[PDB]
Design a protein around this ligand. Structure first.
Ligand SMILES: [Mg+2]
Ligand SMILES: [Mg+2]
Ligand SMILES: [Mg+2]
Ligand SMILES: [Mg+2]
Ligand SMILES: [Mg+2]
Ligand SMILES: [Mg+2]
Ligand SMILES: [Mg+2]
Ligand SMILES: [Mg+2]
Ligand SMILES: [Mg+2]
Lengths: 292, 75, 159, 213, 170
RNA sequence: GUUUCCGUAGUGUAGUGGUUAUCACGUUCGCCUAACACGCGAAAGGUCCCCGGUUCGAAACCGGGCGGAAACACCA
RNA sequence: GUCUACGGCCAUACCACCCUGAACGCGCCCGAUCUCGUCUGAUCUCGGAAGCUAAGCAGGGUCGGGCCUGGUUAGUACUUGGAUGGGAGACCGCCUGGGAAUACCGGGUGCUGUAGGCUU
RNA sequence: ACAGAAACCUCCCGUGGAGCAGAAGGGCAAAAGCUCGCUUGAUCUUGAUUUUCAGUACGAAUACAGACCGUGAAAGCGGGG
RNA sequence: UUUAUCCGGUAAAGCGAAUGAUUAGAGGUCUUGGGGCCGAAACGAUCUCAACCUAUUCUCAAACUUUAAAUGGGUAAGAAG
């Protein structure tokens, strides 16, 4: 034996953490410092661009924070991108661009600004940083939210940012982490961001793998074979997207009504139905051993 | 040569005889104490008020003749 | 004679209550304060920057400033007679909206509303509050019982 | 030795527990707040005779000693050595003080009179409220008289005033004597050496499964 | 028929304690280097101990963690020396196990008259798919009730692959 | 009662700043001696008073105590 | 119904164990071409998509611990004022108001905020 | 393994029992605990306030504002601890 | 003095809620021990005492507190709205 750590005392005194902590989802200190708006403002919000790359789909959304629960003004996911001619490889840093770009333009169609602060168009992979035009609606801004991603150089998060910056939001971004920064020198190549934005990471992996061995191709990326996608092509899917996104960002939904509406959870057992099960036993037991 | 080392005895009696005056608070209290970047600003608000009085006067008379017409249209 | 130190006797005031030791719920610094609004001070351990101090732990005052994360606030503090309306610079964390005013406001909104209406009648409505009157003649009734007889019960020594 | 109990009869001061704050406390005179057959059972030993204070006072540790002993002496005789339990229920425990005796030699010259008035530890005492138990005993139902008088003699080692009372509980439990035989025969109450466990319609059903089995 | 409760080796830990520092330690690092093929981490003293000749923040042991197939390839060629047989009380309460060796040469290694013979502790962390749930950063958690490798599942692990006897009696 | 001071090998006594412990004496073993002394070579011996704390660590630095010592206890 | 993303209040939410997951996601997973990070691709980053709900999570279960309410204890303990009340004294009695806490009994077990799915 | 109440390693539990130069006292956890990189916000400058209060000083603190900067993808955070 | 509304940590209580003391039994080779006694010796039998801890129980804390009063302290109860 030992001492039981988890006494009654353990649970009388155990003070829960703080829900979105237990689930393990949220810097809040850091949500604190991100969100809370100074009080030389009282009502005016503080927008943050939220990016968490999931695992299958990248979600990007602008949110502002109210006392009832931060309200989302605009949300652009990766699984929308089939619309814009991108079938696959859509949790991949280059698709976080398109997603973040989408977001910037779905937002900027509202408050009527799709005709101004377009940001960069051809795409370089440099300092683009929006400069608000005088005598117009001043540009939009938000303080990027990474969540819990160890934000090393190359990571998709502050890469989707590049999308929303490229798309005409005025986020404070530095360049120290865009894929291309040399951590033994301190500049860009920038023409590495060329690739890194358009997926010639994936092209040049789709080409180192192929000439060595077959059937690691196909295993490692079947859906890159299926859907009649290739290297060479890749660069010129994405360029149709940062064009196609930008001619129409708006969401149309899909209308929804049908469901029969069956209940195929399980329900809470009512009092009496627990109340008997003990009385139902203890009569199953008693009877059983008033015998043998 | 020892003695008393405080008391707060009759006292209530005193700092109370003449009253305890809950501080007489005027309207229009001083803005000294406020962040300078308020005042720095609200003085540019206060200074450039008269620039924009022509609007103010005409726009008053509009509402005054519209409400001379509202009260007369009631009559 | 005792020590003057700013946080004497606070061992068990500023101490956070139970099972709340930790992350300050964010709401408490994302509600808006603005000059005129009346506010109750209530010191807090967790954050020490911009603390009030015990001689006004649990007072109320109106707000006169608003800085980036603090609220300048005018409170009355009694001092051997002369009360002093005096101003401190307390960080938001240690402050709430007193609901003190908020019975009135709801009473105003009702009286202006009940005066504007019943003006098209001209019937005089009871606007003022009025203290709890003496409870009116009512009857009681037993139906088909006499009432139950109490007797004081005999003492026996329990232990 | 010590001033007569008189001078420390009455609770004036706030409890001084022996702790970090006072130290160098001479060990409490009394040490055994139960004797006899403390190896008894609940079911064979049915008479919670009690001694109860009637006054808000302090009791010295050394009184409790005597109070006990003189009840171990009369019971034994009476019942025999096996035929009771005695429990004292006031382990002395706020610490009592003594200015250090105003010590001086012969005619003397200087004592300093009052400076550093604060004394030292002298001993230990109990707080006792009214209607609060000091000693209790159990025997057989048979042997009531032989409890009565044992506590009766103990009252005389012992200041103020205090009634002897016979309880309504199984010996040393809290459970009202009119009621055990029933409460045991059906197992609301399960035997546990001296005391007894109240077992409620609460815990997991496999806890019950062990009883009525 | 089980889906992917493939009881499988998460890691193999090699420690070589030698309460000395400098040489007699620095050489021991080359043994793990040689055996594994990865630069081992020097451990150090938690705190000073007198009968031992060790001091707080002095280097003592040198240790490695080997994983993937190259764990399999050093567990095998590890037990072999212990001729595929262990004892009952190494199959531990959390479904890990541990078998120590006496002399580093017995594992297909060349002795230099300089670089002597420091055996090593081999231990291995059995896992299962979805044991990294704990160790990750986002959406962390705990590993079920089952999905936890009990002593006795870790036993007939080792008894149906390396087919050892696992002799009883302490 | 209050203010000082010590305690370390079998004994008298050194010692350090926080890594380490001595001297002399005593004693055990040889030698020399006919035999003791003396002389010459070898040797073993304490929680550094008892404590709790700090610290990598304490014999040594705090706090408490226990034993042995010293010094005051002046106007009447 | 339910989930995801972001959330509010922070256990009616925790913990312990038992049961079931249709679709989408959410996950587990597979690998190191690049970015990046390690002793170890064990964690982070990245490129994926060959499997399965093994677990999380979600959904449910326990005369389950806990937490949250109700009751009881109890008009008890304690107390504002009150008396030329008692009592050698400790203390105790009453009058006028206020009025707790445990053991012991009950019931409950997270509510919803915006954005977006699926059950068309 | 040698390794023993203590070296070294690995799994599990671990609301806080550690830790946070010190008296306590308050405060603290994908922190304010621990490890490393980068550094000088311990910098220059007006004012307002709190605390000791006479509501005088000093000391210590709190809020702002102006420079010039570190850090950080950034929000902020930072004018000694 | 009411009615709203904050503030408050004293009396009491509890200590089967944290800390700190502390009695007692049931229980436990938990550990482990140190003695026995029966055993060469054997968690072998039986004792015993240490310590720990599993349900319990006695009694307490000014430098404790889950609870937690009475008495008390701010505001507010509008034309400066
Ligand atoms: Mg961060
Ligand atoms: Mg991997
Ligand atoms: Mg599952
Ligand atoms: Mg399942
Ligand atoms: Mg329950
Ligand atoms: Mg009178
Ligand atoms: Mg940090
Ligand atoms: Mg500045
Ligand atoms: Mg107090």
């Amino acid at each position: 034996f030992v001492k039981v750590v988890k006494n009654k005392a353990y649970f009388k005194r155990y003070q829960v953490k703080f829900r979105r902590r237990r689930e393990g989802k949220t810097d809040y200190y850091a949500r604190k410092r991100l969100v809370i708006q100074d009080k030389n403002k009282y009502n005016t919000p503080k927008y943050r661009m939220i990016v968490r790359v999931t695992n299958r789909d990248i979600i990007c959304q602008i949110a502002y924070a109210r006392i009832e629960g931060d309200m989302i003004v605009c949300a652009a996911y990766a699984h929308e991108l089939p619309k814009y001619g991108v079938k696959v490889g859509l949790t991949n840093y280059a698709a976080a661009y398109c997603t973040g770009l989408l977001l910037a333009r779905r937002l900027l169609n509202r408050f009527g600004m799709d005709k101004i602060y377009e940001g960069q168009v051809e795409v370089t992979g440099d300092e683009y940083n929006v400069e608000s035009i005088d005598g117009q609606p001043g540009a939009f801004t938000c303080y990027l939210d990474a969540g819990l991603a160890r934000t090393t150089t190359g990571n998709k998060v502050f890469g989707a940012l590049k999308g929303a910056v490229d798309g005409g939001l005025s986020i404070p971004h530095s360049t120290k982490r865009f894929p291309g920064y040399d951590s033994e020198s301190k500049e860009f190549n920038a023409e590495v961001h060329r690739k890194h934005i358009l997926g010639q990471n994936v092209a040049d992996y789709m080409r180192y793998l192929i000439e060595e061995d077959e059937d690691a191709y196909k295993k490692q990326f079947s859906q890159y074979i299926k859907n009649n996608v290739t290297p060479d092509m890749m660069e010129e899917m994405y360029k149709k997207a940062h064009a196609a996104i930008r001619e129409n960002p708006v969401y149309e939904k899909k209308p929804k009504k049908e469901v029969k509406k069956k209940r195929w959870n399980r329900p809470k057992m009512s009092l009496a139905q627990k109340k008997d099960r003990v009385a139902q036993k203890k009569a199953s037991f008693l009877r059983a051993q008033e015998r043998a | 040569a020892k003695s008393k080392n405080h008391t707060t005895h009759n006292q209530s009696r005193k700092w109370h005889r003449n009253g305890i005056k809950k501080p007489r608070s005027q309207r229009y209290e001083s803005l000294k104490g406020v962040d300078p970047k308020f005042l720095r600003n609200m003085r540019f608000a206060k200074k450039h008020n008269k620039k924009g009085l022509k609007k103010m006067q005409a726009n008053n008379a509009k509402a005054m003749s519209a409400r001379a017409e509202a009260i007369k249209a009631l009559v | 004679t005792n020590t003057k130190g700013k946080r004497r006797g606070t061992r068990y005031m500023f101490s956070r209550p139970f099972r709340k030791h930790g992350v300050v719920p964010l709401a408490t610094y994302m509600r808006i304060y603005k000059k005129g609004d009346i506010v109750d001070i209530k010191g807090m351990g967790t954050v020490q920057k911009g603390m009030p101090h015990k001689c006004y732990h649990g007072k109320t005052g109106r707000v006169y400033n608003v800085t980036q994360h603090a609220v300048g606030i005018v409170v009355n503090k009694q001092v051997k007679g002369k009360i002093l309306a005096k101003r401190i610079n307390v960080r938001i964390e240690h402050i709430k909206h007193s609901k003190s005013r908020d019975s009135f406001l709801k009473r105003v909104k009702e009286n202006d509303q009940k005066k504007k209406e019943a003006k098209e009648k001209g019937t005089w409505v009871q606007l003022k509050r009025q203290p709890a009157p003496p409870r009116e003649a009512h009857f009681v009734r037993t139906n088909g019982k006499e009432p139950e007889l109490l007797e004081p019960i005999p003492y026996e020594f329990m232990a | 030795g010590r001033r007569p109990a008189r001078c420390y009869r009455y609770c004036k001061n706030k409890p001084y527990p022996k702790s970090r704050f006072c130290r160098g406390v001479p060990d409490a005179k009394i040490r055994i707040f139960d004797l006899g057959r403390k190896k008894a059972k609940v079911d064979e030993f049915p008479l919670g005779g009690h001694m109860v204070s009637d006054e808000y006072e302090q009791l010295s540790s050394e009184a409790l000693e005597a109070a006990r002993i003189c009840a171990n002496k009369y019971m034994v005789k009476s019942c025999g050595r096996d035929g009771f339990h005695m429990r004292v229920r006031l382990h002395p425990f706020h610490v009592i003080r003594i200015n250090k005796m105003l010590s001086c030699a012969g005619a003397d010259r200087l004592q300093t009179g009052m400076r550093g008035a604060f004394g030292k530890p002298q001993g230990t005492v109990a707080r006792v409220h009214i209607g609060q138990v000091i000693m209790s005993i159990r025997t057989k139902l048979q042997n009531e008289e032989h409890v009565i008088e044992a506590l009766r003699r103990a009252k005389f080692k012992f200041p103020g005033r205090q009634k002897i009372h016979i309880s309504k509980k199984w010996g040393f439990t809290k459970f009202n004597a009119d009621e055990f035989e029933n409460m045991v025969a059906k197992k609301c109450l399960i035997p546990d050496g001296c005391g007894v466990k109240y077992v409620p319609n609460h815990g997991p059903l496999d806890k019950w499964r062990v009883l009525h089995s | 028929e089980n889906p992917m409760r493939e009881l499988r080796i998460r890691k193999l830990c090699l420690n070589i304690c030698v309460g000395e520092s400098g040489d007699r330690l620095t050489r021991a690092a080359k043994v793990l280097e040689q055996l594994t093929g990865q630069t081992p981490v020097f451990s150090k003293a938690r705190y000073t101990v007198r009968s031992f000749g060790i001091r707080r923040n002095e280097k003592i042991a040198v240790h490695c963690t080997v994983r993937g197939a190259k764990a399999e390839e050093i567990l095998e060629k590890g037990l072999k020396v212990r001729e595929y047989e262990l004892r009952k009380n190494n199959f531990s309460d959390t479904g890990n196990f541990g078998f120590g060796i006496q002399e580093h040469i017995d594992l297909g290694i060349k002795y230099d008259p300089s670089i002597g013979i420091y055996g090593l502790d081999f231990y291995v962390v059995l896992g299962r798919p979805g044991f990294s749930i704990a160790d990750k950063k986002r959406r962390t958690g705990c590993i079920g009730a089952k999905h936890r490798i009990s002593k006795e599942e870790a036993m007939r692990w080792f008894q149906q692959k390396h087919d050892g006897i696992i002799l009883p009696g302490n």
